[PDB]
Coordinates of C-alpha atoms and ligand atoms in Angstrom, one line a residue:
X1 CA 17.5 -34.1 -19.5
X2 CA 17.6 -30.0 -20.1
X3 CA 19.1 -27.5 -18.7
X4 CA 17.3 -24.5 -17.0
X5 CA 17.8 -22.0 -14.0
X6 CA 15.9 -21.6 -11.1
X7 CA 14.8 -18.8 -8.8
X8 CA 13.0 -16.8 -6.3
X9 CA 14.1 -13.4 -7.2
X10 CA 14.6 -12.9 -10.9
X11 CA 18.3 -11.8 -9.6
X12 CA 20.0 -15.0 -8.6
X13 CA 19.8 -17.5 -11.1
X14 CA 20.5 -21.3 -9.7
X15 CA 21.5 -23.9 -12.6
X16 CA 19.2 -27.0 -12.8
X17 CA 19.9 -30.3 -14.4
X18 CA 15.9 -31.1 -14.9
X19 CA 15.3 -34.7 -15.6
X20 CA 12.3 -35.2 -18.6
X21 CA 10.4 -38.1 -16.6
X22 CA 8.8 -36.7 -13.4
X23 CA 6.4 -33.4 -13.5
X24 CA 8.6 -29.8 -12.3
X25 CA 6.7 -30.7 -8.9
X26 CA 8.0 -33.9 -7.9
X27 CA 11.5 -32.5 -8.6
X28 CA 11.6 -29.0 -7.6
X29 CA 8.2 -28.6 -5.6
X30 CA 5.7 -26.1 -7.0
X31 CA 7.0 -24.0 -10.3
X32 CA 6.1 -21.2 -12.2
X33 CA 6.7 -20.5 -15.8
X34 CA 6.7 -16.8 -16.5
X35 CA 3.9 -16.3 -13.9
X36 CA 2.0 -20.1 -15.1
X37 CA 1.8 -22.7 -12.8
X38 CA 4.0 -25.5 -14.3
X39 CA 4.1 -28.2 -11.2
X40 CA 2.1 -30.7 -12.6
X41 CA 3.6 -30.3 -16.4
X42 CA 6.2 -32.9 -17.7
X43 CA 9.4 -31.1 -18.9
X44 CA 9.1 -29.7 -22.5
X45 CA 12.6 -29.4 -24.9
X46 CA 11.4 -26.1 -25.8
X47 CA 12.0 -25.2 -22.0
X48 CA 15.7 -25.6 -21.7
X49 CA 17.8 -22.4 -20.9
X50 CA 14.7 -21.1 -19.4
X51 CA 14.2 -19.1 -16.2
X52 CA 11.5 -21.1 -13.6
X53 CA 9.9 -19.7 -10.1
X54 CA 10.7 -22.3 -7.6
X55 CA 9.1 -21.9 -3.7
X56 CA 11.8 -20.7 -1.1
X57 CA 12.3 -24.5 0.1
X58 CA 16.2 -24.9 1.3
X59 CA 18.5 -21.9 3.0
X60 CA 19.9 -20.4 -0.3
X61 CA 16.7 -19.6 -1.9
X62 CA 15.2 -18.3 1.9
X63 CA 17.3 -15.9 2.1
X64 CA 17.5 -14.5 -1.0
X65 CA 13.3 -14.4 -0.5
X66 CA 14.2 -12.3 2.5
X67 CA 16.4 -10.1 1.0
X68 CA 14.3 -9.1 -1.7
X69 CA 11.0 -9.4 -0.7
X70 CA 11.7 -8.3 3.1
X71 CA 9.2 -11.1 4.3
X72 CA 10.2 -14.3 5.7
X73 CA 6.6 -15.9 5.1
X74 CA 6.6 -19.2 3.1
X75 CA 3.3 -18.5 1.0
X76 CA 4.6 -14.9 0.2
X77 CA 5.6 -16.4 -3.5
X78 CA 2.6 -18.2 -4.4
X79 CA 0.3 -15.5 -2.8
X80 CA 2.1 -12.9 -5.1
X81 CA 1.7 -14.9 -8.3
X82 CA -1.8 -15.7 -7.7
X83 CA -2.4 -12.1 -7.5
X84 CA 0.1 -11.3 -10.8
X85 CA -2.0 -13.8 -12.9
X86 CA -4.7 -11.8 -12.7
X87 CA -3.4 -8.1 -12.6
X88 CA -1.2 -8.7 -15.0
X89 CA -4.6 -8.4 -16.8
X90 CA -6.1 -4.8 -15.7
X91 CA -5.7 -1.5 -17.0
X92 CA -3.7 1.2 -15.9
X93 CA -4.8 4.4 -17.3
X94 CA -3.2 7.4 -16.9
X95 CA -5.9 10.0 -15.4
X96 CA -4.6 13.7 -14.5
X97 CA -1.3 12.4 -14.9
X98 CA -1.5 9.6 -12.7
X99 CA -1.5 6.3 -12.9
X100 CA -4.7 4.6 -12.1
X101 CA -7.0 1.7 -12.3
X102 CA -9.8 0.9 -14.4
X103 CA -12.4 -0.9 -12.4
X104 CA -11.9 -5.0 -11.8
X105 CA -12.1 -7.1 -9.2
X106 CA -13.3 -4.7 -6.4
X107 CA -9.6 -3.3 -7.0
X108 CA -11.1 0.7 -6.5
X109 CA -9.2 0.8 -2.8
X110 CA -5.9 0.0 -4.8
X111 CA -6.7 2.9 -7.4
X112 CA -7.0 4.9 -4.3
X113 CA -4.2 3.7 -2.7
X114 CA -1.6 3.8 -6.2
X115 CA -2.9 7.5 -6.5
X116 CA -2.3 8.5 -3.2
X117 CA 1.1 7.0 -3.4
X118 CA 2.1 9.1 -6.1
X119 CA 1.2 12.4 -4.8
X120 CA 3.4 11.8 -1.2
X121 CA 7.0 11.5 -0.6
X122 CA 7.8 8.1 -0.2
X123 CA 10.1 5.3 -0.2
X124 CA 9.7 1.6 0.1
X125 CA 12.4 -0.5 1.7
X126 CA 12.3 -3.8 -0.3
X127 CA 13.8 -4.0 -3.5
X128 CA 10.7 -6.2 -5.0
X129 CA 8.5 -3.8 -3.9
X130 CA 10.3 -0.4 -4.5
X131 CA 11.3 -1.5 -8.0
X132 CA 7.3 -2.1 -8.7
X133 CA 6.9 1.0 -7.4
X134 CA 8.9 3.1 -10.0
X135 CA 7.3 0.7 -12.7
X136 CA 3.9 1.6 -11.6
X137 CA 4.7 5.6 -11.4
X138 CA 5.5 4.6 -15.1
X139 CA 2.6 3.3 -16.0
X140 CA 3.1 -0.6 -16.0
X141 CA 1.8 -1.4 -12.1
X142 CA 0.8 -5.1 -12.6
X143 CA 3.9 -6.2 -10.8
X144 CA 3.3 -3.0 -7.7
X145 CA -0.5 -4.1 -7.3
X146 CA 0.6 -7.8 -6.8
X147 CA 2.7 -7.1 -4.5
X148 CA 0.3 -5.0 -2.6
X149 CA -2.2 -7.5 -2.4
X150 CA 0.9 -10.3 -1.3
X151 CA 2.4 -8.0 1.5
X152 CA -1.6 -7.1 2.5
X153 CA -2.6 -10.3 2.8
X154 CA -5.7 -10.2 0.5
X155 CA -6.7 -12.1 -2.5
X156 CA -7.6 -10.8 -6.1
X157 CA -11.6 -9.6 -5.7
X158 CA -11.9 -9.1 -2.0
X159 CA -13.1 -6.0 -0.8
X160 CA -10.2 -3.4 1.1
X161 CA -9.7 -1.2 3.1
X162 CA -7.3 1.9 2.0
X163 CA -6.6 2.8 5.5
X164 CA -5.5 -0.9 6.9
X165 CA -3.7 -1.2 3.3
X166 CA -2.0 2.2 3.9
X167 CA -1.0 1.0 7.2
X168 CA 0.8 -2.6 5.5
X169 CA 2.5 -0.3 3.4
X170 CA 4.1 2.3 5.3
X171 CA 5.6 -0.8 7.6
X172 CA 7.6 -1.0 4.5
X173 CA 8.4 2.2 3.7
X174 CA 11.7 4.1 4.9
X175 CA 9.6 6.4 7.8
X176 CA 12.4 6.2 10.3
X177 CA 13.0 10.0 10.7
X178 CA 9.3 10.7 11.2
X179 CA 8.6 12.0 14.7
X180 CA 5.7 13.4 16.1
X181 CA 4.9 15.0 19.4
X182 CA 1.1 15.2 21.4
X183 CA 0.6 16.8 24.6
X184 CA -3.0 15.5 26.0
X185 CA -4.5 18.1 28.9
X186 CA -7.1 17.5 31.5
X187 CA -7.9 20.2 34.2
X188 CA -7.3 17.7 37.1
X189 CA -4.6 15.3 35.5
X190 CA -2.7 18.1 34.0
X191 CA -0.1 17.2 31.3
X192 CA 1.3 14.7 29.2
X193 CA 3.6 14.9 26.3
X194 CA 3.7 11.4 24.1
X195 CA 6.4 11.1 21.1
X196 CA 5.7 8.7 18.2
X197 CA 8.0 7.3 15.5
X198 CA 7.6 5.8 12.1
X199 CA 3.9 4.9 11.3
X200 CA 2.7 6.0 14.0
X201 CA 4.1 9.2 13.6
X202 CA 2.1 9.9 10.4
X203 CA -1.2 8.2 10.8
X204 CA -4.0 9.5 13.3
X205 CA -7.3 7.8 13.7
X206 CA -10.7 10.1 14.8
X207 CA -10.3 13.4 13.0
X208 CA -9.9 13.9 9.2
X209 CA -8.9 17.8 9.9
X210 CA -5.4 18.4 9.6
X211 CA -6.3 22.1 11.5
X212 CA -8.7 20.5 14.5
X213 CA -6.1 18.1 15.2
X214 CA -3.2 21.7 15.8
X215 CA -5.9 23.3 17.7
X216 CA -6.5 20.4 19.7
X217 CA -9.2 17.5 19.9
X218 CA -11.4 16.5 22.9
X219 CA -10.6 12.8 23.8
X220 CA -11.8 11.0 27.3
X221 CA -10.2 11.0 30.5
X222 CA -10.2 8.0 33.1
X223 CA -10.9 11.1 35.9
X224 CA -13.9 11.6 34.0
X225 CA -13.8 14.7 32.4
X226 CA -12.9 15.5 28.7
X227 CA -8.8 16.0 27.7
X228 CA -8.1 17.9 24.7
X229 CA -5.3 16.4 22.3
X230 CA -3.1 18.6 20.1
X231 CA -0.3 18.3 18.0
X232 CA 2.9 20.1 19.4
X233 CA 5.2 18.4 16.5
X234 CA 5.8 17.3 13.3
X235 CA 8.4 16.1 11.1
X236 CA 7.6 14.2 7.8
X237 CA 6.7 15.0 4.8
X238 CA 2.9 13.9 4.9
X239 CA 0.6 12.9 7.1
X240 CA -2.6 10.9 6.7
X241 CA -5.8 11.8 8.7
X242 CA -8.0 9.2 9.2
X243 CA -11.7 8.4 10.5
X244 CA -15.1 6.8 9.9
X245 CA -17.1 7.7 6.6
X246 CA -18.9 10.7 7.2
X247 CA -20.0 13.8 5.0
X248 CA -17.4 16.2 4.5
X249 CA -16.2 18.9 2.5
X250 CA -12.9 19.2 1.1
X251 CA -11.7 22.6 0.0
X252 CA -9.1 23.3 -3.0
X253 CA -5.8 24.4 -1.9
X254 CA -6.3 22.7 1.6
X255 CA -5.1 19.3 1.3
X256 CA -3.3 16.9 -1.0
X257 CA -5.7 14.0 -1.7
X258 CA -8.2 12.0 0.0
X259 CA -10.4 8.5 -0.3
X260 CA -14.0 8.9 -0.3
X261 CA -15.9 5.7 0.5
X262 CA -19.3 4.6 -0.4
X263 CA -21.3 1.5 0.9
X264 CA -19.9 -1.0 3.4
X265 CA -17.3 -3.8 4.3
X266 CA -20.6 -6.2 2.3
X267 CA -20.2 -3.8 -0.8
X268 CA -18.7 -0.6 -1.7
X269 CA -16.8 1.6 -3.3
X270 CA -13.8 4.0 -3.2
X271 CA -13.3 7.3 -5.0
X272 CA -10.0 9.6 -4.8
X273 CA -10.4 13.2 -4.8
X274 CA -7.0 14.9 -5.4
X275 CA -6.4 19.4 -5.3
X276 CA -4.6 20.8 -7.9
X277 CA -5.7 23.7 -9.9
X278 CA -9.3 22.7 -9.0
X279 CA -10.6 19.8 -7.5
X280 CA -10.8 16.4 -9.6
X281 CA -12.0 13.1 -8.2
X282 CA -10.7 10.2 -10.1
X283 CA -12.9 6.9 -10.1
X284 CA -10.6 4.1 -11.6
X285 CA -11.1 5.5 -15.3
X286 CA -13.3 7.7 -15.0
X287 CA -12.4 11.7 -14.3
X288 CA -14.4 14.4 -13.0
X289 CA -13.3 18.2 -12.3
X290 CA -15.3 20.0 -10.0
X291 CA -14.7 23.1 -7.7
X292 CA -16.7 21.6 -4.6
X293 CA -16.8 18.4 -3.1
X294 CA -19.0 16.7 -0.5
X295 CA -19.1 13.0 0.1
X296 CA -18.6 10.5 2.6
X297 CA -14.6 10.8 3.0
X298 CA -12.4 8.3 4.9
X299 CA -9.0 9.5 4.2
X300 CA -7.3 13.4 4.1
X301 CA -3.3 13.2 3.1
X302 CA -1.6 16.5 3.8
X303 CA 2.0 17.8 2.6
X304 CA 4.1 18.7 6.1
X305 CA 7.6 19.0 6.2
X306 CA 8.3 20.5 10.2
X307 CA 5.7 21.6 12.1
X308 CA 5.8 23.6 15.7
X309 CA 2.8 24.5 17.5
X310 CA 2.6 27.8 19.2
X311 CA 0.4 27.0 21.6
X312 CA 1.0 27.7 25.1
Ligands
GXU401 C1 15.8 -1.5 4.9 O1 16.0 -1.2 6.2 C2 14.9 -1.5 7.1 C3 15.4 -2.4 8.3 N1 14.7 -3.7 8.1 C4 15.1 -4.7 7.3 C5 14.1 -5.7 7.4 N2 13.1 -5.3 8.3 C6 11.9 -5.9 8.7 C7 11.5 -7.4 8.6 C8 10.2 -7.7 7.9 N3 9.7 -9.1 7.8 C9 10.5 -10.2 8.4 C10 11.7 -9.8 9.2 N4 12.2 -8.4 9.3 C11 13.5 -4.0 8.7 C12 12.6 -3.1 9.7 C13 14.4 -7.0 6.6 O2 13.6 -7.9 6.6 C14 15.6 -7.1 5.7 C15 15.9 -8.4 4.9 C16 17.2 -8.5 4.0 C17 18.2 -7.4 4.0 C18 17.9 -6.1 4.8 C19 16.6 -6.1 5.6 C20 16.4 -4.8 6.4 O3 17.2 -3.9 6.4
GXU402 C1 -19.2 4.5 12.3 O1 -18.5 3.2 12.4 C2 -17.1 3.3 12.5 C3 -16.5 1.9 12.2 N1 -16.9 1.3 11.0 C4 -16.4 1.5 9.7 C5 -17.2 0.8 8.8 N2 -18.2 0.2 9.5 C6 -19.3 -0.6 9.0 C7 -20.3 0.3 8.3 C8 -21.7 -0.3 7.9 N3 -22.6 0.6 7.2 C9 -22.3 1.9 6.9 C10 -20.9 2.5 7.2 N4 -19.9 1.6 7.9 C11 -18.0 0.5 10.8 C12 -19.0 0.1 12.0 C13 -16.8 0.8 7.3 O2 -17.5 0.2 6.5 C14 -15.6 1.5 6.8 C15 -15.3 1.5 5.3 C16 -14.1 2.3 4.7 C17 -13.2 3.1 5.7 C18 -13.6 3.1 7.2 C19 -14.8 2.3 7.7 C20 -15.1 2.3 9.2 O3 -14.4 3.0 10.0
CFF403 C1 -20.2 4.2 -7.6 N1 -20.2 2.8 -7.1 C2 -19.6 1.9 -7.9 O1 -19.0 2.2 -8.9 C3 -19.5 0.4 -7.4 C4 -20.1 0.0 -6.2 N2 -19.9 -1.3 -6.1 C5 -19.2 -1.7 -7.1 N3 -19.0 -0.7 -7.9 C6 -18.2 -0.8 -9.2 N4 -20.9 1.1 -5.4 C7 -21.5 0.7 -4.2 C8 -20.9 2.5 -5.9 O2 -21.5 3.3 -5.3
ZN404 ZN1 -7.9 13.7 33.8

């Protein structure tokens, strides 16, 4: 017999009487060790007064899960330290005075995605996941890029997609306030006014151009001429433009960031281009300053705060 504490959290500790005979398994279900799997290990001496990861399995330990992880999915755990083993392992550079990632695992859409992070206003709602966060603005992001993967539902060495990822993310994120307000126009239909909220509010698919989508956009309509789509609205402090890869030029002093994909959903390969005094694109490690930049881009963020169009 030793003593130890269990937990889902790393918050609420949970004394355990642990009995030396059977593996942690048959006793407590599947157990983690400071990130090691430890189900099928007999109890060690040396392990008493330690801290053990223990699956969410009775109503205490769910809703502690739920509380600071925000998901009520059973694999979320194991999914998450899966994922830690092997980040735990990267690098995180610091590149133009961000934190980045130096190339593993067909990780370059999370560089992308941590970089783009830092550069918009942002907070995350769960405590697991907005903790990580400040610890990988600091450099250490093992724990945030774990927990990326977990809440994204991908696996260590799959190929990603930054949009779809950016999208998980911001379900977490505090975006309540964010409101945003179309009006669509066809000569025969006339009119229509939409308002969005949260996500929604800051993500558009079809047009990378912050400026085309103010001056307006031609869409379909079902009477079967072309609408045109403009923004009357806008409050939040980013928003994220969106479409297929496609050559494109990004201008300094026009936008915030942007994620530049190369290849396809087989292989590829993200790049983030970020404005500051000139443009730099950042490639996990690897930095390069240029004052031009074509490529195949994906992604445009742009800084907003309130918006009003003065369009008639
Ligand atoms: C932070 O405010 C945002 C409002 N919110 C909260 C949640 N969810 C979504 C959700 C996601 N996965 C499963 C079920 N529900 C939203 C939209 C929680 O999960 C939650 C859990 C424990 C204490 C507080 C909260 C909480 O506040
Ligand atoms: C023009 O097709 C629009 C839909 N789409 C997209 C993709 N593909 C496959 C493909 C195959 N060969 C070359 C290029 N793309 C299609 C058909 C991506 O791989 C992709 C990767 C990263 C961000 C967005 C996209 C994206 O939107
Ligand atoms: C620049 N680059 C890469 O660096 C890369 C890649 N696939 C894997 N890597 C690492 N592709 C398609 C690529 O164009
Ligand atoms: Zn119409």
């Amino acid at each position: 017999t030793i003593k130890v504490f269990t937990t889902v959290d790393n918050i609420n500790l949970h004394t355990q009487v642990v009995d030396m005979s059977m593996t942690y398994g048959q006793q407590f279900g599947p157990t983690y060790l400071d990130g090691a799997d430890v189900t099928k290990i007999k109890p060690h001496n040396s392990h008493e007064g330690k801290t053990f990861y223990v699956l969410p399995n009775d109503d205490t330990l769910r809703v502690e899960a739920f509380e600071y992880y925000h998901t009520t999915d059973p694999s979320f755990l194991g999914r998450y330290m899966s994922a830690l083993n092997h980040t735990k392992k990267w690098k995180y550079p610091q590149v133009n005075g961000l934190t980045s990632i130096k190339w593993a695992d067909n990780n370059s859409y999370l560089a992308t995605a941590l970089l783009t992070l830092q550069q918009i206003e942002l907070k995350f709602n769960p405590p697991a996941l907005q903790d990580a966060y400040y610890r990988a603005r600091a450099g250490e992001a093992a724990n945030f890029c774990a927990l990326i993967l977990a809440y994204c539902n991908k696996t260590v060495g799959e190929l990603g997609d930054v949009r779809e990822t950016m999208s998980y993310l911001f379900q977490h994120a505090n975006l309540d306030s964010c409101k945003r307000v179309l009006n669509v126009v066809c000569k025969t239909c006339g009119q229509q006014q939409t308002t969005l909220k949260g996500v929604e509010a800051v993500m558009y698919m079809g047009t990378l151009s912050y400026e085309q989508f103010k001056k307006g956009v031609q869409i379909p309509c079902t009477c079967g001429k072309q609408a045109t789509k403009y923004l009357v609205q806008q409050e939040s402090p980013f928003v994220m433009m969106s479409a297929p890869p496609a050559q494109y030029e990004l201008k300094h002093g026009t936008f915030t960031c942007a994620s530049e994909y190369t290849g396809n959903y087989q292989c590829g390969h993200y790049k983030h281009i970020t404005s500051k005094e000139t443009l730099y694109c950042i490639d996990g490690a690897l930095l390069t300053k240029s004052s031009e930049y074509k490529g195949p881009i994906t992604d445009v963020f742009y800084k907003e705060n309130s918006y009003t169009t003065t369009i008639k």
